[PDB]
Design a protein around this ligand. Structure first.
Ligand SMILES: [Ca+2]
Ligand SMILES: [Ca+2]
Ligand SMILES: [Mg+2]
Ligand SMILES: [Mg+2]
Ligand SMILES: [Mg+2]
Ligand SMILES: [Mg+2]
Ligand SMILES: [Mg+2]
Ligand SMILES: [Mg+2]
Ligand SMILES: [Mg+2]
Ligand SMILES: [Mg+2]
Ligand SMILES: [Mg+2]
Ligand SMILES: [Mg+2]
Ligand SMILES: [Mg+2]
Ligand SMILES: [Mg+2]
Ligand SMILES: [Mg+2]
Ligand SMILES: [Mg+2]
Ligand SMILES: [Mg+2]
Ligand SMILES: [Mg+2]
Ligand SMILES: [Mg+2]
Ligand SMILES: [Mg+2]
Ligand SMILES: [Mg+2]
Ligand SMILES: [Mg+2]
Ligand SMILES: [Mg+2]
Ligand SMILES: [Mg+2]
Ligand SMILES: [Mg+2]
Ligand SMILES: [Mg+2]
Ligand SMILES: [Mg+2]
Ligand SMILES: [Mg+2]
Ligand SMILES: [Mg+2]
Ligand SMILES: [Mg+2]
Ligand SMILES: [Mg+2]
Ligand SMILES: [Mg+2]
Ligand SMILES: [Mg+2]
Ligand SMILES: [Mg+2]
Ligand SMILES: [Mg+2]
Ligand SMILES: [Mg+2]
Ligand SMILES: [Mg+2]
Ligand SMILES: [Mg+2]
Ligand SMILES: [Mg+2]
Ligand SMILES: [Mg+2]
Ligand SMILES: [Mg+2]
Ligand SMILES: [Mg+2]
Ligand SMILES: [Mg+2]
Ligand SMILES: [Mg+2]
Ligand SMILES: [Mg+2]
Ligand SMILES: [Mg+2]
Ligand SMILES: [Mg+2]
Ligand SMILES: [Mg+2]
Ligand SMILES: [Mg+2]
Ligand SMILES: [Mg+2]
Ligand SMILES: [Mg+2]
Ligand SMILES: [Mg+2]
Ligand SMILES: [Mg+2]
Ligand SMILES: [Mg+2]
Ligand SMILES: [Mg+2]
Ligand SMILES: [Mg+2]
Ligand SMILES: [Mg+2]
Ligand SMILES: [Mg+2]
Ligand SMILES: [Mg+2]
Ligand SMILES: [Mg+2]
Ligand SMILES: [Mg+2]
Ligand SMILES: [Mg+2]
Ligand SMILES: [Mg+2]
Ligand SMILES: [Mg+2]
Ligand SMILES: [Mg+2]
Ligand SMILES: [Mg+2]
Ligand SMILES: [Mg+2]
Ligand SMILES: [Mg+2]
Ligand SMILES: [Mg+2]
Ligand SMILES: [Mg+2]
Ligand SMILES: [Mg+2]
Lengths: 117, 69, 98, 142, 63
RNA sequence: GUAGGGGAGCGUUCAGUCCGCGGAGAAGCCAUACCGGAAGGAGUGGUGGAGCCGACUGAAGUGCGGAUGCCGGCAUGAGU
RNA sequence: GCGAGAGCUAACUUCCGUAGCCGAGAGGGAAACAACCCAGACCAUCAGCUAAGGUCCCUAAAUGAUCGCUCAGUGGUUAA
RNA sequence: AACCGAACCUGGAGAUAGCUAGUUCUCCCCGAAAUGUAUUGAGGUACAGCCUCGGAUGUUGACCAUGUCCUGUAGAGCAC
RNA sequence: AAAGGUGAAAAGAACCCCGGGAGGGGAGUGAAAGAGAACCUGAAACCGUGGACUUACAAGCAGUCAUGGCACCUUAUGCGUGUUAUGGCGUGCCUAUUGAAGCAUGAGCCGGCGACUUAGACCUGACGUGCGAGCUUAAGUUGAAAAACGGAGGCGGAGC
């Protein structure tokens, strides 16, 4: 019994090719560059996911001291003074509190400063 | 009995090694190691310096009895 | 405003059905109790432990299984290419509490 | 999940460089351009302000406004580096010196080139952007 | 098929026993010898060790 | 985690047995946001116009990106 | 890196010993950078703490506090 | 008879090739070596050494402490 | 060397239209001309026409992740789909190597062909079955829509 490759290879190739949407040029049309681009793209997808965690970390922080200094203290002497205010621990995305309710972020500034005295 | 439902004893047939055929195992170089005289093959049980040649004490015949302990 | 502090469940203030990591006990009406970490009511803020005594009731809605991803991984010149599937379970919970 | 804003607003301010150390006036203006004073809201968008630098001519400089500050530009032609306008000389056109400092502290990508638009340097005491009434920043931080 | 390597047979390597490979003791054959009288005698019958698998298939049918 | 050893498996053709499907439409082809831990598998629609799926067992010419690999088609250089 | 020979007490030299790394080691730092510093990646999270290394703006984080030192851009290139 | 230090064709013939290149489906478990001897040996092999699988045994393994013996380097010294 | 296929049946397209023709458009036949003789299916590379979203201060292994914009709504109003602008990050693949983005090998692209096999009463192990102190046949004979018979001989059983 002979068992030629037919239908198998086209199906595999077409699944690779379909992963290529708006890939530029022969990235979208030739199988070999499509598959090769996907190897490097693997690298990027995994690394980036882990990194995106750390990137939103950064955006968080960068808003929080901007509001903090608007109230006359930096990030450092703030997220300290909430933690030194101990039970105050809300921590996760204080960014949004600073970015939408300033009546609240002002009270948190007063709390941190009271804790540092 | 159902021939659909015949089943060989588990463990009595194992599958052949399919050497080649992926990076899911046994990639590129087959079972083999890389370079070297491992390639289309030959040469037997021989070390190709000096094969432990010990001397020879010899007598050709024999004939032995059938045993009934 | 209200959001899971995605370490597990603890949160601030305001009521709206939302996703979370799985909650063990199922069906509905888990009524799962929630402990305040912040509140803004009447825009009258109360926070940290003082607010934490405040309750937040919330019923369980549905168990789920969020959208699929692939864990695919690659290294160079070494034949290291591996592909696997993954899918995270979750738990809708409808906010309701004080 | 995280809040991102409009683009709706543009806010102007005059910085007085008169007697300030350059370089420190530099980072002050560069941050007010980047948008780090309001919450950075989003990196993608230039939420930063328009800045008007007046009395740019009188910027102070320490150690050597001579001798030290050798600004340099390369021309594309062989022998085209020997273009080292340096020093006090560029305070014959002061608005560029300040404008160079700030530009080295904005990022080099497509936003930064666009952010260059938001710096408005006038060497004299006066500025003509009266129409967008800017009001003032000033000295130092905390 | 499968030959025995007849270089194994009347040569040392008796196959015999609990499956282990005896061999002889070698130096001072009938090449010249002054040397000791307690070595000229201690050349009777040795038995090798970590090569046996090679020796066996030289002569697995015990000729 | 490289050579290497071990484990469990996906898909292709052929064969035996079963369950069946097909001109009110089969394989093949084409699109797709569904499913499975992967190899993969289904749903629906378009095309086609005569054969074919699923399950269990068996046997293999059984899985390609490379080989200045082969055959064929078509491009670039260029309206030069 | 340490201990030695050969070498000019040269070499990203060569040859032994010894520990660690790369080889097959991703991640953070060292501008870039196999070997150096921190640390060994089962999968997911728009949660928290630290290590090396950092906290003027590119660029996450004290234009930090207290004593001094250097007015050379020393910092940011050897010596008799 | 358009390539003559030994023509062309067919055959042995799939010459031989310690040399180059290539060797394709998937996830899981473990995980090396570039050392030592020998070699018409040095980019090849044989046996060790390091990997894995299965069986047997069953802490015999690992650091660390105490006890005990062995040693002529660092340093030092000038008694050869 | 390459080699193939209208349709069940030639019923193989009278007649008309543009054209020297070639080619086509109708009318007819036929279930179908979505079969018309460059005659089953008709993938891919390659060439085009139309549409959506886009692009003429931009430095770029061609992606990836994040967010805004504009379309769209048949596994589909969502944790959607397509496409964009902008930020962050980001040194093709293989081979060969102490060490490859390498200015080191290979490759224009796509399709198909393309490499660990077979053999032998041969050795040596793992797993599984039958019979077990014993196990088994070879050549062949006779029967074959099927398999039985056939102890010659082979392996244990004694070693030095
Ligand atoms: Ca022309
Ligand atoms: Ca030309
Ligand atoms: Mg990345
Ligand atoms: Mg934080
Ligand atoms: Mg086999
Ligand atoms: Mg395997
Ligand atoms: Mg090779
Ligand atoms: Mg060969
Ligand atoms: Mg031989
Ligand atoms: Mg010799
Ligand atoms: Mg790479
Ligand atoms: Mg490598
Ligand atoms: Mg004997
Ligand atoms: Mg149909
Ligand atoms: Mg499909
Ligand atoms: Mg028909
Ligand atoms: Mg084959
Ligand atoms: Mg390959
Ligand atoms: Mg090819
Ligand atoms: Mg060709
Ligand atoms: Mg010397
Ligand atoms: Mg060296
Ligand atoms: Mg190597
Ligand atoms: Mg390592
Ligand atoms: Mg690393
Ligand atoms: Mg690194
Ligand atoms: Mg870096
Ligand atoms: Mg460096
Ligand atoms: Mg280096
Ligand atoms: Mg690396
Ligand atoms: Mg911390
Ligand atoms: Mg530290
Ligand atoms: Mg900062
Ligand atoms: Mg200071
Ligand atoms: Mg001639
Ligand atoms: Mg001719
Ligand atoms: Mg000749
Ligand atoms: Mg040949
Ligand atoms: Mg021959
Ligand atoms: Mg020869
Ligand atoms: Mg491991
Ligand atoms: Mg010797
Ligand atoms: Mg060697
Ligand atoms: Mg060995
Ligand atoms: Mg074991
Ligand atoms: Mg022991
Ligand atoms: Mg012990
Ligand atoms: Mg000394
Ligand atoms: Mg016909
Ligand atoms: Mg015509
Ligand atoms: Mg005509
Ligand atoms: Mg009709
Ligand atoms: Mg037609
Ligand atoms: Mg047709
Ligand atoms: Mg025609
Ligand atoms: Mg037909
Ligand atoms: Mg056709
Ligand atoms: Mg067109
Ligand atoms: Mg177009
Ligand atoms: Mg321009
Ligand atoms: Mg533009
Ligand atoms: Mg260009
Ligand atoms: Mg982009
Ligand atoms: Mg080299
Ligand atoms: Mg490199
Ligand atoms: Mg190149
Ligand atoms: Mg190259
Ligand atoms: Mg080479
Ligand atoms: Mg080339
Ligand atoms: Mg036999
Ligand atoms: Mg025979």
């Amino acid at each position: 019994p002979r068992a030629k490759t037919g239908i198998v290879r086209r199906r595999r190739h077409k699944k690779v090719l379909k992963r290529a949407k708006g890939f530029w040029g022969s990235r979208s049309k030739q199988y070999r560059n499509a598959f090769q681009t996907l190897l490097n793209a693997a690298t990027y997808e995994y690394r980036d996911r882990r990194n995106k965690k750390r990137d939103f970390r950064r955006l968080w922080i960068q808003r929080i001291n901007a509001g903090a200094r608007l109230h006359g203290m930096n990030y450092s002497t703030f997220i300290n003074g909430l933690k030194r205010a101990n039970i105050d621990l809300n921590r996760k995305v204080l960014a949004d509190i600073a970015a939408r309710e300033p009546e609240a972020f002002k009270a948190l500034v007063d709390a941190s400063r009271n804790a540092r005295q | 009995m159902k021939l659909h439902d015949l089943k060989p004893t588990p463990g009595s047939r194992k599958d052949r090694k399919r050497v080649g055929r992926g990076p899911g195992g046994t990639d590129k170089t087959a079972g083999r190691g890389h370079k070297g005289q491992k390639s289309r093959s030959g040469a037997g049980k021989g070390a190709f310096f000096e094969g432990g040649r010990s001397r020879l004490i010899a007598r050709l015949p024999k004939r032995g009895f059938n045993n009934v302990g | 405003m209200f959001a899971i502090i995605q370490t597990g469940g603890k949160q601030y203030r305001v009521s709206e059905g939302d996703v979370i990591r799985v909650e063990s006990l199922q069906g509905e009406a888990g009524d799962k109790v929630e402990l305040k970490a912040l509140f803004v009511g009447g825009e009258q803020t109360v926070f940290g432990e003082d607010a934490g005594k405040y309750t937040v009731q919330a019923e369980v809605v549905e168990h789920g299984r969020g959208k699929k991803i692939y864990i695919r991984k690659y290294k160079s010149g070494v034949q290291y290419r591996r592909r696997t599937g993954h899918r995270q379970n979750f738990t809708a919970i409808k906010i309701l509490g004080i | 999940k995280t809040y991102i804003p409009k683009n709706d607003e543009q806010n102007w301010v005059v910085v007085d460089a008169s007697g300030v150390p350059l370089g420190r006036l530099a980072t002050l203006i560069a941050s007010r351009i980047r948008g780090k004073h309001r919450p950075d809201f989003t990196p993608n968008m230039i939420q930063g302000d328009f800045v008007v630098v007046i009395n740019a001519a009188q910027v102070a400089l320490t150690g050597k406004k001579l001798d030290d500050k050798v600004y340099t530009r390369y021309t594309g032609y062989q022998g085209g580096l020997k273009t080292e306008t340096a020093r006090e000389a560029l305070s014959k056109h002061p608005e560029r010196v300040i404008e160079h400092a700030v530009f080295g502290m904005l990022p080099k990508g497509r936003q930064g080139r666009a952010m260059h638009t938001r710096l408005k340097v006038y060497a004299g005491e006066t500025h003509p952007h009266s129409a967008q009434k800017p009001q003032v920043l000033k000295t130092q931080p905390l | 098929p499968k030959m025995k390597t007849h270089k194994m047979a009347k040569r040392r390597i008796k196959i015999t026993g609990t499956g282990k490979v005896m061999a002889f003791k070698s130096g001072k054959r009938h090449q010249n010898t002054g040397k000791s009288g307690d070595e000229i005698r201690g050349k009777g019958k040795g038995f090798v060790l970590a090569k046996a698998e090679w020796a066996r298939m030289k002569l697995m049918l015990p000729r």
